Subunit: 27 residues, 3 copies
């Protein structure tokens, strides 16, 4: 009689920080 | 025998908001 | 005995794009 499956894995790491925004308005 | 490994974890959470974009064209 | 835990999940999605940059320098 084999054991039950192990616990579900942890959630992965957080994704990277988002890319920079669009360029600002003209001065 | 031991049970098999558990189900794979979910994807991680979303990253933080990106930084501000480049400064606009000069006046 | 129970199995090993599942592998940790994938890296999450990227954070949202940043806000628009600061306005350009003055003329």
């Amino acid at each position: 009689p084999p054991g039950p499956p192990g616990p579900p894995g942890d959630d992965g790491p957080s994704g990277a920080e988002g890319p920079p925004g669009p360029p600002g308005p003209p001065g």
